[PDB]
Write a protein that binds this ligand. Structure first.
Ligand SMILES: [Cl-]
Ligand SMILES: [Cl-]
Ligand SMILES: [Cu+2]
Length: 125
C-alpha cells in the first residue's frame, strides 16, 4: 500500500479530492503532485502535523491569512503545502515523511475544508 510518489486531484467542481486517503513510508522522501482539474475552482492541498484539531486551526489561520495563498505565516503545524492553484494548474511538493501516524490533508480555500475537501495521509512504520 505504501508509496513514495502520490498523484491526487480535485473531483469535478466539488469540494473533494479524488482520493480520501493514501499511505507513505516513514522517514523517506515523498513526492505529491496535486492537479486542480476543475474548470472554475481554487484549490490547494495542505498536509498538517496531526489530525482534525490541527487541521481546524490551520484552516482558521488560513482564512485570516487571506489571498492569494490562504496559508499561515509559518509551517510549525504544516508538513507540506502547495500554492493556491487556479483551474488547470498543478504543483509537485516534496517532504521527508514524518513519524508513523495519521495526518489530515485539506484545502484551505475558504469553506472548502468544512465542505469536505479533506483526507488522511497514513504514514506507515
Ligand atoms: Cl513507491
Ligand atoms: Cl495555497
Ligand atoms: Cu479547494
Amino acid at each position: 500500500g505504501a508509496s513514495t510518489t502520490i498523484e491526487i486531484a480535485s473531483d469535478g467542481e466539488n469540494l473533494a479530492y479524488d482520493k480520501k486517503e493514501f499511505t507513505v513510508p516513514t522517514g523517506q522522501t515523498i513526492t505529491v503532485t496535486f492537479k486542480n482539474t476543475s474548470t472554475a475552482q481554487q484549490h490547494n492541498i495542505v498536509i498538517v502535523k496531526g489530525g482534525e484539531d490541527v487541521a481546524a486551526k490551520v484552516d482558521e489561520e488560513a482564512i485570516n491569512a487571506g489571498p492569494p495563498d490562504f496559508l499561515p505565516a509559518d509551517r510549525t503545524n504544516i508538513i507540506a503545502a502547495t500554492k493556491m492553484l487556479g483551474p488547470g494548474g498543478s504543483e509537485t511538493i516534496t517532504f521527508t515523511a514524518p513519524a508513523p501516524g495519521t495526518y489530515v490533508f485539506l484545502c484551505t480555500y475558504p469553506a472548502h475544508y468544512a465542505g469536505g475537501m479533506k483526507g488522511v495521509m497514513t504514514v506507515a512504520p
